Design a protein that fits this description.
The structure holds two protein chains of two kinds. Chain A is an alpha/beta fold. Chain A contains seven helices and twelve strands. Chain A is about 25% helix and about 20% strand. The longest helix of chain A has 14 residues. The chains are: A alpha/beta, B alpha+beta. Bound molecules: sinefungin (SFG) and zinc ion (ZN) (2 copies). Chain A: It is found in: Host nucleus; Host cytoplasm.
Chain lengths: ~300, ~110
């Protein structure tokens, strides 16, 4: 298990290319738990390993980077993942987080309420979502593609993610959406990443790297989720906290990636290739304005 | 004239043998940092833990106004270094101690001025 020294395990390409049928997820290491460093919360370690893995991708990192983090609140009233994101992102990065329930955050701004009520004027360089509804894990009904916040997320990605931007959306066996898998085909690259501290869970982060705004690959979401479940079912991942102990190279390298304003007619193949290599972001650079719809009654 | 004194309330609660506020967000770090009190990224040294600022500010945690005219919070969005000996009560530590405005270390916990 040389994967034990990595921050996690990504879905191997060959498993992406299968055409499996959806099965129940039965993890061999179910119930096992990695031994976390003294006093470290599970979610701090999880976000840390997610960020360590993202460090290995071709993320666009412009000056004045824009990152939005959905599902940032916890049952403790704080935002561990947001703290890890702020630690990881370059100083001066605009970080906005949100959650259905109130919480205390280190983000530049926090919106409370259902994801569907959140609107932003600008586009974003990085979208993180840990939104999860535990009522989805029902083993007595068919495991079908879920709507709810997933719907929103999809829309958001297509409307408010800058070309060349990236996303990490949390899913599980039962918390998933076919259209999100399909959207993964609109990035230069994609994967499903399982952190090593949470390998005993069906949880994964659907990572889309370098948004292209159009499908470069046609992905059937139902088949792709079945493929992910098959991978997890046949590849036990050894729980490991090793990667947590070396933070010397943790910070996201500031790359000063160029930011251009462009009309869709101008996105030629040279521009698309620059997008696919993490060397270009396409969006405006006006002020960042956000709001949460309030229903009155 | 009336104002709630949450600082004194928490101090008295501690003296009364009360459970210190929990779930302050401890960060993973090298522990070879500058050791300064409040920083833009975790700066804990060999003798410190670094916590997310907001999670160790009594006013943020209890949902009350910050004790100054601006309502400004000097911990939110930053990282606070706590001596490992006191990391069981980061809120109480930040509340009871002061940062040296010249070197940036905790007075009596790293400040050699
Ligand atoms: N429709 C929704 N809109 C916004 N947030 C949601 C929605 N559904 C579920 N959530 C949130 O998703 C979160 C799931 C949490 N386990 C996230 C943990 C948190 N990220 C942490 O760092 O500990 C909850 O706090 C919910 O408030
Ligand atoms: Zn505060
Ligand atoms: Zn001093």
């Amino acid at each position: 298990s040389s994967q034990a020294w990595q921050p996690g395990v990504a879905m191997p390409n060959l498993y992406k290319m299968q055409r499996m049928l959806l099965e129940k997820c039965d993890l061999q290491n179910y119930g096992d738990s990695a031994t976390l460093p003294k006093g470290i919360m599970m979610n701090v370690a999880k976000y840390t390993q997610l960020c360590q893995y993202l460090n290995t991708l071709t993320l666009a990192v412009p000056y004045n980077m824009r990152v939005i983090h959905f599902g940032a609140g916890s049952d403790k009233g704080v935002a561990p993942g947001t703290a890890v994101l702020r630690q990881w992102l370059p100083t001066g990065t605009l970080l906005v987080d949100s959650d259905l329930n109130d919480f205390v955050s280190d983000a530049d701004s926090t919106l409370i309420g259902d994801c569907a009520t959140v609107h932003t004027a600008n586009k974003w360089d990085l979208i993180i979502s840990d939104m999860y509804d535990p009522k989805t894990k029902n083993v007595t009904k068919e495991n079908d593609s879920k709507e709810g916040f997933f719907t929103y997320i999809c829309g958001f990605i297509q409307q408010k993610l800058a070309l060349g931007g990236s996303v990490a959306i949390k899913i599980t066996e039962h918390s998933w959406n076919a259209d999100l898998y399909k959207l993964m085909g609109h990035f230069a690259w994609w994967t499903a990443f399982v952190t090593n501290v949470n390998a005993s869970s069906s949880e994964a982060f659907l990572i889309g790297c370098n948004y292209l705004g159009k499908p470069r690959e046609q992905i059937d979401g139902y088949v792709m989720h079945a493929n992910y479940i098959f991978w997890r079912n046949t590849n036990p991942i050894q729980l490991s906290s090793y990667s947590l102990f070396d933070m010397s190279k943790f910070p996201l390298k500031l790359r000063g990636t160029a930011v251009m304003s462009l009309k869709e007619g101008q996105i030629n193949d040279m521009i698309l290739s620059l997008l696919s290599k993490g060397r270009l972001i396409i969006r405006e650079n006006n002020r960042v304005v956000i709001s949460s719809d309030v229903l009155v009654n | 004239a009336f104002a709630v004194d949450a600082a004194k309330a928490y101090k008295d609660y501690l003296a009364s043998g009360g459970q210190p506020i929990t779930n302050c967000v401890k960060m993973l770090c090298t522990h070879t940092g500058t050791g300064q009190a409040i920083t833009v990224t975790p700066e804990a040294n060999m003798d410190q833990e670094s916590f997310g600022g907001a999670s160790c500010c009594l006013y943020c945690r209890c949902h009350i106004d910050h004790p100054n005219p601006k309502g400004f919070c000097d911990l939110k969005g930053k990282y606070v270094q706590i001596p490992t000996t006191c990391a069981n009560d980061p809120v109480g530590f930040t509340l009871k101690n002061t940062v040296c405005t010249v070197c940036g270390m905790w007075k009596g916990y790293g400040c050699s001025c």
